[PDB]
Design an enzyme around this catalytic site. Structure first.
Site, PDB file in Angstrom:
ATOM      1  N   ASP C  49      -8.192 -17.656  -4.202  1.00  0.00           N
ATOM      2  CA  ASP C  49      -8.316 -16.857  -5.413  1.00  0.00           C
ATOM      3  C   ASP C  49      -9.608 -17.210  -6.136  1.00  0.00           C
ATOM      4  O   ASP C  49      -9.894 -18.388  -6.379  1.00  0.00           O
ATOM      5  CB  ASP C  49      -7.111 -17.090  -6.326  1.00  0.00           C
ATOM      6  CG  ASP C  49      -7.104 -16.175  -7.539  1.00  0.00           C
ATOM      7  OD1 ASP C  49      -7.984 -15.293  -7.638  1.00  0.00           O
ATOM      8  OD2 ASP C  49      -6.213 -16.339  -8.398  1.00  0.00           O
ATOM      9  N   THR C  82      -8.704 -10.395  -6.580  1.00  0.00           N
ATOM     10  CA  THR C  82      -9.896 -10.927  -7.232  1.00  0.00           C
ATOM     11  C   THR C  82     -11.137 -10.708  -6.375  1.00  0.00           C
ATOM     12  O   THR C  82     -12.204 -10.360  -6.892  1.00  0.00           O
ATOM     13  CB  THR C  82      -9.706 -12.414  -7.536  1.00  0.00           C
ATOM     14  OG1 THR C  82      -8.578 -12.586  -8.403  1.00  0.00           O
ATOM     15  CG2 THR C  82     -10.944 -12.983  -8.212  1.00  0.00           C
ATOM     16  N   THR C  83     -11.014 -10.899  -5.060  1.00  0.00           N
ATOM     17  CA  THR C  83     -12.146 -10.674  -4.169  1.00  0.00           C
ATOM     18  C   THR C  83     -12.508  -9.199  -4.056  1.00  0.00           C
ATOM     19  O   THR C  83     -13.638  -8.879  -3.674  1.00  0.00           O
ATOM     20  CB  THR C  83     -11.850 -11.241  -2.779  1.00  0.00           C
ATOM     21  OG1 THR C  83     -10.687 -10.603  -2.237  1.00  0.00           O
ATOM     22  CG2 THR C  83     -11.608 -12.742  -2.856  1.00  0.00           C
ATOM     23  N   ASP C 377       0.937 -13.494  -8.091  1.00  0.00           N
ATOM     24  CA  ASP C 377      -0.075 -12.483  -8.375  1.00  0.00           C
ATOM     25  C   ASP C 377       0.363 -11.106  -7.895  1.00  0.00           C
ATOM     26  O   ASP C 377      -0.037 -10.091  -8.479  1.00  0.00           O
ATOM     27  CB  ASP C 377      -1.405 -12.873  -7.731  1.00  0.00           C
ATOM     28  CG  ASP C 377      -2.049 -14.070  -8.405  1.00  0.00           C
ATOM     29  OD1 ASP C 377      -1.642 -14.408  -9.535  1.00  0.00           O
ATOM     30  OD2 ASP C 377      -2.964 -14.670  -7.802  1.00  0.00           O
TER      31      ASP C 377
END
Lengths: 494, 505, 522, 68, 357
Positions: C49, C82-83, C377
């Protein structure tokens, strides 16, 4: 020793990967004098390259031996000797002595020679007509610049047919030589403007009054090795007149000639050869048949040569001496007029013709070279035969036999890098193709469309010479064992 | 690897950034600094790259481009040469990416191959209008005035350049055949044309102004050995018994010279031309005959004399033939107390001579480049008559058709061809920086021009707006534009084919 | 302090951004590679993450602080991917720095991307549509498998389509004047070591984290309307006469305060501190379930669910100390689940708000940390997924589809913003380009198909049918033409709307940078 | 690269052979005596094994196992 | 960055493996370490050596966490069980950066190789009686044969089987095992070494030679609890002495040519990694790995499944008369957990340390 020594070779081993393959590339090398050389042949680069490690010079001299003798497909086998030392890294932890390493490769080398004769196809007994020569030019292009394969096809095949002593029946390996064909560098003009002249062309600019007649012919060649001032005027006028009485159109003189002697030669329009090199002088002795006479005098017809006609023309904009025979018997005489933009492209075509003409000479010397699949096609079936060869005779040498088969995997690994293909995708494709007759005419396809399928070598006409393949393995294996046979690196006193 | 090529291209683009103000008449001259303190300020890249110090060995390719530019084409060093390496600039981000340049070299090769058919497609045939060598070459001469410092005064050069090449034989056109004499000082409008062989520079020794400049019909004479007393004569072994024996050497040398000059005097030639200089021994001997004599004849001068009178170098008096004695219709000596030989009435002469005069030595050096570039335009126009708009705007309309073939690719080469058309947008971008125009305003109307008018879109620079150079009488030979991509093809493919360099010591 | 001037100060932050960009680009997609960070105490952690990486990333330039604020902002907006979000802001500054060098003004790119993104909302809404081809809970099942991006546990999402999806279906509550909401953190994540990750079990209710030690606690409990008692109170000299006075009274008060809770009818008692064995004796005779060593933060979620109010200490309006029954909660039943010799309290049938819990099992703490934050998440994505029924096609194929919309939009605006639109569309091709780097594929082969096939519907007339392409599109693993609609890969509208809008605003503050001013610290 | 590993030779011996020549002189009735002096001047002279190892300080780690 | 950071993880894995390279087997030699405090540790146990060694490296502590999991699963025969994971971690990918193979593809190939390896173990293994005391007694003497208590093992084996069968009966479904921590470990110093429900507690008088001998008693006694426990968990008994790596090496080489694909080389790469385990048994016993390993491939395949390496003279003998047998969970629970721990370390790309917590 073996280590750092092999790692230093791996630097050149990965650098020479572009020297082979149809997608291969050239490199730039600079000597101590500042002269730049751009070519795809590693034999020329390593010759002028300064070598530090002593044992690397043995590898360089081993590759240069194939260029002097064979000189055909040396770029494909250039890195073949480098991988043989790379597969020996795994044998370090196993503890196999160099004795079993040599015995493992030697027994597999003799077994490879017997497998090449079983899978060889397409025996060519002609080696004369240009139809067989056009098929020999395609594999030369596969190891060289891929820009234009059409120009060099008709350029080389036409020059070989002229130097070939064509007659009613010519047997017993008619004479052929590389030095019999010379490439004349002409700056300017497209590569497609290169022509072929059945005669010999000289590079020089005459003083003037060039010969304007052709059909009249009748040309000859002569090859040569206050009161005091008035005597020279009578002697020179007498010596120049006696030569002109024999009808000598061209005079070859290696010594110095003043402007006074060249004045009387302009009366009949007698050209002189200003080239000090002995290559053009000794070539006319084998064609015109003129014997060098140190004295001037009146040369007898025994020392006088015979040439068809003399004509001066401007090819690239400058006047050059061109000896051309329009109609008549022509044997062991031919030349190639090369048209190019810059010297960088001239040296690339020069190495293509030098190795192309040497490929014909290396083909005609043995009884026959037949045909063998090239461009990494043959080495695929060799891995399967060598793998079964190790299991055929189990023992301690079986581990060295397996390493000898892995050493042939660098060729398909190199071809995928030059073409941008993934070796991980291509390896099982060739492993599922040549492995389980459809494997004789099939080969690997190198092209942007190779991802869809693998085309055979029948339509591509990409082959390999059997004579060079047998000798390339003999030199690469012996050179690899020679480096491993070196005990220690010790300098020399004085 | 690929990282080394990036540093090699940046070194080649670095000099190309300074060479941008060249293509087009609005370009600006570039200053250079050499080690000899003698520099040439010009837009020509062949002169700049020759005197520029080369560091990386791949930078020598740009020098070979200018050498191949004159051999294959003969002009366009201010236009085509700077554009030979622009494909590497657009290929710079492709090097960081995993894209292999092997397909990039094939992408540009297939792009320039289809562009040649487009150049010949848009080529207009002027033979239907029956245009002679006046209207055709005059409109092409004003196009050659681009990148040249002379613009408003170039109207005098148009009349001189056209009339000089038409006097020369149109079957054989070469820069080495026609002569060019650069005379420093004076004015530009004082340049005149010469109908015959002219001397290299001048020879002024002893009496100079005493030689009349008005002759009727002089005759040309050729000599070889140098004439002088006990100075330049050939050394020989002479036995000297006494000091009084030196007088015999003076007589032996003079009688040897006198008998050769007396036998050749029967020809009656008013002009004496020797391969070597002429001394005072022959000067006073020729003064009694009231004949002109000039020595120190260069080898390039003698070659042009053979084309007219048909003479030959005579080392002795026994080989003198009546066929080697010519004549001329009128001879007049032309500047700064320097006599200039001018021959007239030579219909058999296959060579021409042009007299150039100017105050600045650097400006007249570009005029010589203008003469070499104008002859190549006339040579390729007379062989094949085709109309192509100059100013680098020819590739603008071509770029639209190039995008049509890219949509038929559907492969890795699709985006490669789009980069080739994007490289063509660098040409108008470099022109906007030279004239201060907005590059975005021109590129916006550039993409909207091929959607309506098509044909020829020239971007006229005189109205500070968009226009057509075809109606402006701007014509360029098509052979220059066709071979322009061939010079860039071998140049781009050569650098991309070198992944590493080797330097010893 | 000093000041650095010139345009090279902007490139210093770009090169610093590209330096940390390629670090986090290796974690993009399932084919990517995880990274390891060290706290410089000798301990290390393994997470892919970017929110944790950027939090532990030391950057002295202000450009690194923006990435930290952007990562923390996407945690509340999305929480995952997130990426696939933060990395977009990397190459955004690379292409913007190229144009501004010569012929482009810094505000032109600012106004170029602002007008383009504002008009792209209608372009996104064209591709955006309600969930279709999904029956029942398969809407979240197809999205649960999409976790392969930014999370490497996506290979196990086949079994996770039950425990994870059904976890937030039972937390449904109604508040805020008739608005269905899914309170965050209501799912309690428990960790265990053993068996395999496939042994995870879903609990339709809150599960307290504790361990049963003393055997005096009852092993069985039954009956409804179980009252929960939360207590944070700790219950466990010259001459010995003074010691006996304080000892006899202390033992009496502690046992008396326990009886105050007994009189309130509390079936289970939750104590923050420890409980003496004598206090548990009163729980056996009164049939009360004692619990000791509880976390204060764990008891706060109980107050928001069952309604049990924590009590600091016994007290009242008068001088007498007692326990009122109003502090008790409401739950249906209490379940004791023994996992690897560890028993946890399972609270079900909450009053105020319904919740759930998930027990995780693995090898070591690093195997659990990969299953803890990653699945947590994914729950935050489902929170925003069920809020807006509109979804977008998964696989990151919407960036290449909108490129043809920007080609015609560039000709509409034009002027000086046309170059910014072309570079903005080219920046969208970098997202699938990075996916091909970690997958060992050819980017030029995939992008050529992304441009050819997805633009066929825009060139052809939609009213003439002749669709001949779906445009919906790609494939990362096999590099072949397949559809995610049949493969069950879909993304919620939160992954783009209210996601990339704030991410593309990071270049606004970067392009307005002039110089750098650094003050020497104390 | 392989190789690496290690070789067993006198390097490991130098630690254990240091006490050999040191303890060889005092061996037997004809041997000598070793002294132990502090900063205060107290001298303890004996060859007994108590001072040879436990009360002897040397950089060789092998002597620790010999003392134990 | 790139592939340079993975070199430090592989180099440190090989540097630690070189220390435990010769530590496999009952013939394992002794290793010595040094600390800044001035002390040292000398023992033949590879687990105790790696536990005391503390080095600075991100993946150094992660490898030690794998041993902690195997201590509860097996915990016995650390030379033949625990330290075998170090040799696999180094040799799992001999060629990676050179071949430029995607590590995730390798992991998918390691799972297919591990799945087929577990099937080969079940083929050569044979079930035995779990309630047989004479069968487990010979298995207890296998791990404790490194000491002088071999002749005195009658007392050690008596305290072993009596403590295993004391209670049990704690599992009807997923074994009849219990926790051995409730058993009193208190020992009496001095003397000679020879002298439903919940888990109960029982103790028997035991005397050691000295204080240092008491620490060695827990090696040949407390570790024997896993001998009978491995039989109750997996009654199937497999050949020991490094015989399992020879059968898997033949199957991985043959099945590689059948599967083909891009995973062919990573599939058989596990075979070369497993061949390093028996090499230590050959070197410490005085044999030659060059000639023997070539014969082990043909003998353990065509000859029989009991062919193994002799732990004494180093010759090639059958495990039937060798007297030592390894339960199935020895190789099963080791290689399976070794590959899973190795894949996590191979996925590491870049590492940025030295910031803060």
């Amino acid at each position: 020793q073996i280590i750092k020594s092999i790692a230093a070779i791996r630097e050149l081993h990965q650098m020479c990967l572009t020297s082979m393959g149809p997608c291969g590339r050239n490199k730039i090398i600079v000597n101590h004098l500042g002269k730049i050389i751009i070519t795809n042949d590693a034999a020329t680069m390593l010759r002028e390259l300064d070598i530090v490690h002593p044992a690397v010079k043995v590898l360089v001299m081993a590759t240069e031996q194939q260029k002097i003798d064979m000189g055909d497909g040396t770029n494909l086998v250039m890195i073949l000797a480098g991988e043989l030392l790379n597969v020996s890294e795994k044998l370090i932890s196993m503890g196999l002595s160099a004795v079993e390493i040599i015995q493992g490769y030697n027994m597999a080398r003799k077994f490879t020679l017997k497998e090449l004769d079983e899978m060889v196809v397409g025996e060519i007994t002609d080696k004369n007509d240009k139809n067989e020569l056009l098929k020999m030019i395609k594999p030369v292009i596969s190891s060289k610049k891929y820009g234009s394969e059409d120009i060099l096809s008709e350029l080389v095949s036409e020059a070989v047919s002229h130097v070939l002593p064509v007659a009613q029946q010519a047997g017993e390996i008619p004479y052929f030589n590389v030095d019999s064909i010379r490439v004349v560098k002409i700056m300017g003009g497209s590569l497609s403007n290169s022509t072929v002249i059945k005669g010999m062309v000289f590079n020089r600019e005459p003083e003037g009054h060039v010969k304007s007649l052709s059909e009249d012919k009748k040309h000859k060649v002569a090859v040569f090795t206050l009161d005091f001032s008035k005597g020279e005027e009578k002697q020179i006028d007498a010596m120049m007149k006696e030569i002109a009485d024999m009808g000598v159109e061209c005079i070859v003189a290696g010594a110095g000639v003043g402007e006074l002697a060249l004045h009387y030669l302009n009366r009949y329009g007698i050209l002189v050869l200003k080239v000090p090199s002995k290559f053009e002088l000794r070539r006319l002795c084998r064609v015109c048949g003129a014997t060098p006479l140190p004295r001037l005098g009146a040369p007898t017809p025994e020392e006088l040569g015979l040439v068809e006609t003399v004509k001066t023309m401007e090819i690239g904009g400058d006047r050059v001496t061109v000896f051309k025979q329009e109609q008549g018997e022509i044997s062991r005489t031919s030349t190639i007029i090369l048209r190019g933009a810059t010297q960088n492209n001239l040296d690339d075509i020069e190495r293509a013709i030098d190795d192309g003409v040497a490929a014909v000479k290396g083909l005609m010397k043995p009884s026959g070279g037949k045909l063998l699949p090239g461009a990494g096609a043959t080495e695929i079936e060799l891995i399967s035969r060598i793998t079964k060869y190790g299991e055929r005779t189990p023992g301690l040498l079986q581990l060295a036999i397996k390493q000898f088969a892995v050493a042939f995997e660098v060729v398909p690994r190199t071809l995928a890098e030059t073409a941008g293909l993934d070796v991980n995708e291509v390896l099982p494709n060739l492993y599922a193709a040549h492995n389980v007759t459809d494997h004789l005419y099939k080969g690997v396809d190198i092209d942007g469309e190779s991802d869809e399928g693998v085309k055979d070598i029948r339509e591509e006409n990409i082959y390999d010479m059997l004579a060079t393949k047998k000798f390339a393995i003999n030199v690469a294996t012996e050179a690899a064992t020679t480096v491993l046979s070196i005990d220690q690196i010790i300098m020399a006193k004085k | 690897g690929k990282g080394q090529i990036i540093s090699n291209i940046n070194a080649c683009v670095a000099v190309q950034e300074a060479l941008k103000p060249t293509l087009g008449p609005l370009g600006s001259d570039i200053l250079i600094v050499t080690s000899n303190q003698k520099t040439t300020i010009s837009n020509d890249g062949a002169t700049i790259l020759k005197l520029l110090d080369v560091v990386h060995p791949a930078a020598k390719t740009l020098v070979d481009i200018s050498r191949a530019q004159d051999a294959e084409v003969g002009d366009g060093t201010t236009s085509v040469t700077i554009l030979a390496g622009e494909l590497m600039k657009e290929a710079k981000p492709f090097l960081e990416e995993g894209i292999s340049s092997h397909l990039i070299m094939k992408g540009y090769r297939k792009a320039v191959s289809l562009a040649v058919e487009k150049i010949n497609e848009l080529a207009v045939d002027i033979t239907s209008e029956k245009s002679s060598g006046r209207e055709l070459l005059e409109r092409c001469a004003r196009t050659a005035m681009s990148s040249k410092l002379i613009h408003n005064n170039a109207d005098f050069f148009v009349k001189m350049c056209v009339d000089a090449v038409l006097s020369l034989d149109r079957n054989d056109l070469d820069d080495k055949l026609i002569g060019i004499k650069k005379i420093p000082g004076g004015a530009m409008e004082e340049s005149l044309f010469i109908n015959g062989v002219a001397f290299k520079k001048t020879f002024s020794y002893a009496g100079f102004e005493q030689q009349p400049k008005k002759f009727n019909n002089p005759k040309i004479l050729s000599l070889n050995v140098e004439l002088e007393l006990k100075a330049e004569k050939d050394n020989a072994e002479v036995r000297v018994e006494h000091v009084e024996d030196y007088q015999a050497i003076v007589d032996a040398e003079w009688q040897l010279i006198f008998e050769k000059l007396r036998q050749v005097e029967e020809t009656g030639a008013n002009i004496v031309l020797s391969k070597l200089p002429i001394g005072d021994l022959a000067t006073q001997f020729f003064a009694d005959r009231n004949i002109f004599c000039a020595g120190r004849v260069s080898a390039d001068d003698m070659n042009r004399v053979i084309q007219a009178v048909g003479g030959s170098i005579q080392s002795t008096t026994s080989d003198i033939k009546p066929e080697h004695l010519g004549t001329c219709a009128l001879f007049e000596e032309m500047i700064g107390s320097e006599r200039y030989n001018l021959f007239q009435g030579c219909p058999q002469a296959k060579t021409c001579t042009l007299l150039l005069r100017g105050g600045a030595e650097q400006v007249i050096a570009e005029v010589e480049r203008s003469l070499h570039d104008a002859i190549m335009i006339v040579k390729r126009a007379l062989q094949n008559k085709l109309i192509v708009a100059g100013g680098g705007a020819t590739e603008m309309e071509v770029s639209k058709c190039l995008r049509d073939y890219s949509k038929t690719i559907a492969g890795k080469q699709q985006m490669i061809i789009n980069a080739f058309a994007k490289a063509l947008e660098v040409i108008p971008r470099q022109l906007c920086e030279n004239a201060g125009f907005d590059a975005i305003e021109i590129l916006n109307k550039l993409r909207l021009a091929h959607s309506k008018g098509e044909k020829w879109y020239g971007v006229v620079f005189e109205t500070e707006n968009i226009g057509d150079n075809f109606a402006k009488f701007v014509w360029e030979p098509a052979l220059v534009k066709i071979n322009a991509l061939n010079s860039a093809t071998e140049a781009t493919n050569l650098i991309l084919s070198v992944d590493e360099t080797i330097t010893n010591k | 302090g000093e000041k650095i001037s010139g345009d090279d100060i902007r490139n210093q932050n770009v090169l610093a951004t590209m330096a940390v960009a390629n670090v986090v680009k290796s974690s993009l997609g399932p084919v990517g590679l995880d990274k390891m960070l060290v706290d410089d105490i000798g301990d290390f952690t393994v997470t892919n993450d970017g929110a944790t990486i950027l939090s532990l990333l030391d950057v002295q330039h202000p450009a690194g602080k923006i990435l930290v604020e952007l990562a923390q902002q996407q945690d509340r907006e999305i929480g995952d991917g997130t990426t696939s979000v933060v990395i977009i802001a990397s190459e955004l500054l690379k292409r913007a720095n190229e144009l501004v060098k010569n012929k482009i003004h810094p505000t032109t790119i600012i106004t170029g991307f602002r007008v383009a993104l504002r008009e792209a909302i209608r372009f996104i809404n064209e591709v955006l549509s309600t969930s279709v081809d999904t029956l029942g809970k398969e809407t979240l099942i197809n999205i649960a498998k999409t976790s392969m991006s930014s999370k490497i546990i996506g290979a196990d999402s086949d079994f996770f389509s039950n425990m994870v999806v059904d976890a937030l279906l039972a937390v449904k509550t109604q508040n805020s004047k008739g608005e269905i909401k899914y309170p965050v953190k209501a799912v309690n994540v428990l960790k265990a070591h053993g068996k395999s990750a496939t042994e995870s079990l879903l609990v339709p209710g809150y599960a307290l984290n504790c361990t049963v030690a003393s055997q005096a606690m009852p092993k069985r409990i039954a009956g409804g309307n179980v009252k929960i008692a939360c207590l944070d109170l700790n219950l466990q000299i010259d001459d010995p006469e003074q010691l006996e006075q304080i000892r006899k009274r202390e033992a009496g008060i502690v046992l008396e305060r326990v009886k105050k809770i007994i009189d309130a009818g509390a079936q289970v008692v939750l104590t923050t501190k420890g409980i003496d064995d004598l206090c548990l004796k009163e729980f056996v005779e009164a049939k009360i379930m004692g619990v000791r060593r509880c976390k204060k933060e764990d008891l706060r979620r109980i107050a928001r669910a069952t309604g049990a109010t924590l009590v600091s200490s016994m007290s009242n309006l008068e001088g007498e100390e007692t326990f009122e029954s109003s502090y008790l909660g409401l739950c249906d039943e209490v379940v004791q689940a023994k996992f690897s010799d560890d028993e946890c309290i399972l609270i079900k049938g909450t009053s105020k708000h319904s919740s759930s819990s998930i027990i995780l099992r693995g090898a070591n703490d690093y195997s659990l940390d990969e299953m803890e934050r990653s699945l947590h998440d994914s729950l935050s994505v489902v929170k925003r997924t069920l809020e807006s029924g509109n979804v977008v096609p998964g696989g990151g194929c919407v960036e290449a589809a909108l490129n043809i919309y920007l080609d015609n939009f560039a000709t509409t605006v034009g002027s000086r913003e046309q170059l910014a639109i072309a570079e903005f569309a080219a920046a969208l091709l970098i997202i699938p380009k990075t996916l091909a780097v970690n997958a060992a594929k050819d980017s030029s082969e995939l992008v050529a198909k992304l441009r050819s096939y997805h633009a066929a519907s825009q060139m052809a007339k939609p009213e003439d049918v002749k669709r001949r392409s779906y445009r919906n599109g790609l494939d990362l693993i096999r590099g072949k033409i397949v559809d995610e609609i049949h493969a069950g890969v879909l993304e919620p509208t939160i992954s783009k709307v209210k996601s990339l809008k704030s991410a593309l605003e990071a270049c606004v503050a970067i392009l307005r940078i002039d110089t750098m001013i650094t003050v020497d610290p104390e | 690269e392989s190789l690496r590993r290690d070789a067993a030779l006198k390097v490991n011996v130098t630690s254990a052979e240091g006490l050999q020549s040191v303890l060889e002189t005092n061996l037997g009735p004809k041997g000598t005596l070793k002294m132990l002096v502090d900063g205060a001047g107290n001298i303890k002279l004996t060859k007994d094994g108590k001072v040879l190892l436990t009360e002897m300080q040397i950089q060789s780690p092998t002597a620790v196992l010999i003392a134990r | 960055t790139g592939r340079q950071a993975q070199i430090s993880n592989i180099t440190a894995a090989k540097a630690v493996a070189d220390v435990i390279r010769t530590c496999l087997g009952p013939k394992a030699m002794l290793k010595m370490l040094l600390d800044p405090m001035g002390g040292l540790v000398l023992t033949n146990d590879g687990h105790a050596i790696l536990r005391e060694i503390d080095v600075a490296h991100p993946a150094a502590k992660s490898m030690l966490e794998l041993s902690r999991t195997q201590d509860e699963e097996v915990g016995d025969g650390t030379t033949t069980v625990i330290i075998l994971a170090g040799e696999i971690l180094a040799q799992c990918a001999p060629y990676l950066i050179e071949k430029n193979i995607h590590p995730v593809i390798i992991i998918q190939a390691l799972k297919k190789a591990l799945t087929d390896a577990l099937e080969v173990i079940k083929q050569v293994s044979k079930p035995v009686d779990v309630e047989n005391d004479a069968a487990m007694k010979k298995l207890i003497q296998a791990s404790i044969g490194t000491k002088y208590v071999i002749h005195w093992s009658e007392k050690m084996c008596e305290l072993a089987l009596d403590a295993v069968k004391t209670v049990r009966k704690d599992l009807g479904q997923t074994f009849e095992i219990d926790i051995k921590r409730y058993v009193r470990v208190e020992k009496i110093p001095g003397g000679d070494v020879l002298d439903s429900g919940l888990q109960k507690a029982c103790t028997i008088m035991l005397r050691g030679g000295s204080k240092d001998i008491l620490n060695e008693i827990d090696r040949n006694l407390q570790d024997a609890m896993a001998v009978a426990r491995n039989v109750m968990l997996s009654p199937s008994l497999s050949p020991g002495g490094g015989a399992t790596e020879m059968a898997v090496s033949v199957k991985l080489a043959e099945k590689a040519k059948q599967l083909e694909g891009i995973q062919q080389w990573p599939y058989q790469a596990v075979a070369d990694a497993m061949e390093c385990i028996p090499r230590t048994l050959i070197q410490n016993a005085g044999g030659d790995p060059i000639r023997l390993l070539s014969q082990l491939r043909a003998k353990h395949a065509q000859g029989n499944f009991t062919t193994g390496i002799d732990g004494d003279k180093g010759k090639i003998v059958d495990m039937v008369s060798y007297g030592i047998w390894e339960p199935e969970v020895i190789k099963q629970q080791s290689v399976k957990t070794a590959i899973e721990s190795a894949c996590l370390l191979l996925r590491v790309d870049d590492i940025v340390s030295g910031v803060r917590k």
